[PDB]
């Protein structure tokens, strides 16, 4: 039983949301597998993608999956998975797990500016 409309303009109802979600989570895992293990983003992304893949594997119904995940509808889950895949393929280029490229200068981040010493 598929829904008539998702309630949002411009979003189409997915015919196969389970396979799309599983393929997107597998692509996110294959993207973050190239990252070093000491990076925190890889560990947190692997944890959330593993628990959401367990959620889409335990529940074969659409409405039970949207109730179990709890973050919007399943089309929004597909949108979030594509967004995270884009983010991870940008993380493999940007490499943000290293040190700071520019430290804060002196008297930069203190707000009251003209106080002496």
């Amino acid at each position: 039983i598929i829904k008539a409309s998702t309630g949002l303009t411009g979003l189409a109802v997915s015919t196969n949301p389970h396979h799309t979600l599983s393929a997107l989570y597998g692509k996110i895992l294959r993207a973050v597998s190239k990252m070093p293990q000491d990076a925190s983003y890889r560990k947190y992304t692997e944890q959330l993608v593993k628990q959401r893949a367990d959620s889409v594997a335990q529940h074969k119904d659409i409405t039970a999956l949207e109730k179990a995940v709890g973050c919007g509808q399943v089309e929004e889950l597909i949108v979030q998975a594509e967004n995270e895949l884009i983010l991870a393929r940008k993380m493999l280029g940007w490499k943000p797990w290293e040190k700071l490229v520019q430290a804060a200068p002196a008297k930069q981040w203190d707000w009251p500016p003209a106080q002496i010493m």
């Binding site: 925190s40 983003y41 947190y44 959330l48 959401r52 973050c71 919007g72 979030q80 967004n83 995270e84 884009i86 983010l87 940008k90 940007w94 490499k95 943000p96 797990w97 290293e98 040190k99 700071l100 490229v101 520019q102 430290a103 804060a104 200068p105 002196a106 008297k107 930069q108 981040w109 203190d110 707000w111 009251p112 500016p113 003209a114 106080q115």
Partner: protein
């Protein structure tokens, strides 16, 4: 009980503190300092090289969908070495929260345009450029959005005068609206509203 004192929201404090430590852990390259201000607002103080990779991250992560960008604000603090600061305020509709991402920028040093991340930065980054001279590189078209077409200078810097440099009047010899040096009929009366006694002892040593 104190009914004239605003009570802070603890569920907007603990979640924002855990998320601030989370975003400090996930991006150690760009994030220098996260701080939870009075009023339960979270500030992230990034490097100027990390404007795009931080605002992309908060756009597209599962634990942070800061997909709405409400306003990009420029503050001119001429005391500092990098005088301008640029504040991106982001709203997360999925997790019902707000974040502020602050960076420091000089007028000659360019900044990364967030137009590829959020399309509202197509116009907001123009406005700071019209008012501070903060050049945003890799912008679609960086034009003059609010001031006059023949305006020379950026008005919202603190080194710019309040009444401007020039005025406009109609010349019926040239049959056009001409530009004249400024002469006010009554000058702006600068009031010295400075407090000689300090009133906040908690902000006395907040600078280091």
């Amino acid at each position: 009980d104190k009914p004239t004192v605003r009570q802070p929201d603890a569920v907007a404090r603990s979640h924002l503190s855990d998320f601030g430590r989370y975003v400090a852990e996930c991006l150690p390259k760009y994030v220098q300092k996260v701080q939870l201000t009075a009023g339960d607002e979270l500030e992230v103080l990034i490097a100027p090289e990390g404007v795009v990779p931080v605002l992309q991250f908060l756009k597209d992560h599962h634990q942070a969908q800061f997909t709405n960008l409400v306003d990009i604000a420029g503050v001119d603090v001429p005391c500092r070495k990098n005088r301008f600061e640029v504040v991106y305020n982001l709203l997360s509709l999925r997790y019902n929260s707000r974040i502020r991402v602050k960076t420091y920028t000089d007028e000659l040093t360019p900044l990364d345009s967030a137009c590829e991340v959020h399309k509202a930065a197509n116009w907001y980054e123009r406005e700071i450029w019209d008012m501070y001279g903060v050049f945003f590189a890799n912008h679609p078209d960086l034009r003059r959005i609010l001031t006059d077409y023949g305006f020379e200078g950026h008005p919202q810097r603190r080194d710019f005068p309040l009444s401007g440099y020039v005025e406009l009047r109609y010349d019926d010899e040239k049959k056009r609206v001409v530009c004249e040096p400024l002469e006010l009929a009554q000058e702006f009366r600068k009031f010295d509203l400075s407090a000689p006694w300090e009133q906040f002892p908690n902000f006395r040593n907040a600078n280091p």
